[PDB]
Write a protein that binds this ligand. Structure first.
Ligand SMILES: [NH3+]CCc1ccccc1
Ligand SMILES: [Ca+2]
Length: 223
């Protein structure tokens, strides 16, 4: 997260860290046995880490649970990042509590200008590299679909939206991939891609979760 702030421990209780020996992506807890992330985060050997603040220190609220199954969206296209969403089932149910909680799925899509909370353990620099140990947060509005498409001609589909600031300085970045965009209490986006981080006229692009709610709910119920 560039241009953001320290969330404070367990203030984002649905935020998960995906770990394969190291943090590599975020995700969101949507019920006690299922996490939503980005399809471009797919890999074998995933451990889900819930209740994290400092990912390098055991602080007392963590739950580490191996993934039993990953389900990349049937139509994921890794070239274009269309349909950049993946479900991860936990080998055992998370113990839900204050510091570990699910986030609701949308009931409908969110509107341009809606303010959202984006969070992660990604790079905090727009030039260079600095990875935080504690969770970072950013408040950012959903941008109009026309400014998004103008920013990235030929690359935005109906399954994507942009959020952030056209002036730059505030954005998601490397290592934030897969994590949540929460607006009005609902998971409306997943950190997906962009052109660099926090650059002018290059806002973050996010998977548009409201298009996937029927797939998510059907998939979970059948798995
Ligand atoms: N705003 C761009 C976020 C991002 C950065 C690098 C890889 C994936 C996603
Ligand atoms: Ca920790």
């Amino acid at each position: 997260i560039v241009g953001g702030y320290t969330c404070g421990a367990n203030t984002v209780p649905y935020q998960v860290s995906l770990n394969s020996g190291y943090h590599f992506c975020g995700g969101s807890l949507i019920n006690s046995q299922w996490v939503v992330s980005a399809a471009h985060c797919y890999k074998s050997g995933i451990q889900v880490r819930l209740g994290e603040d400092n990912i390098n220190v055991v602080e007392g609220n963590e739950q580490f649970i191996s993934a039993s199954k990953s389900i990349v969206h049937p139509s994921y296209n890794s070239n274009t990042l269309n349909n950049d969403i993946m479900l991860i089932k936990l080998k055992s149910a998370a113990s839900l509590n204050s510091r570990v909680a699910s986030i609701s799925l949308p009931t409908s899509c969110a509107s341009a200008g809606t303010q959202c909370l984006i969070s992660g353990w990604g790079n905090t620099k727009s030039s260079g590299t600095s990875y935080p140990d504690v969770l970072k947060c950013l408040k950012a509005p959903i941008l109009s679909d026309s400014s998004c498409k103008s920013a990235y001609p030929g690359q935005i589909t109906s399954n994507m939206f942009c959020a952030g600031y056209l002036e730059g300085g505030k954005d998601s970045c490397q290592g934030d991939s897969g994590g949540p965009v929460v607006c009005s209490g609902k998971l409306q986006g997943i950190v997906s891609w962009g052109s660099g981080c926090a650059q002018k006229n290059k806002p973050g692009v996010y998977t548009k979760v409201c298009n996937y709610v029927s797939w998510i709910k059907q998939t979970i119920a059948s798995n």
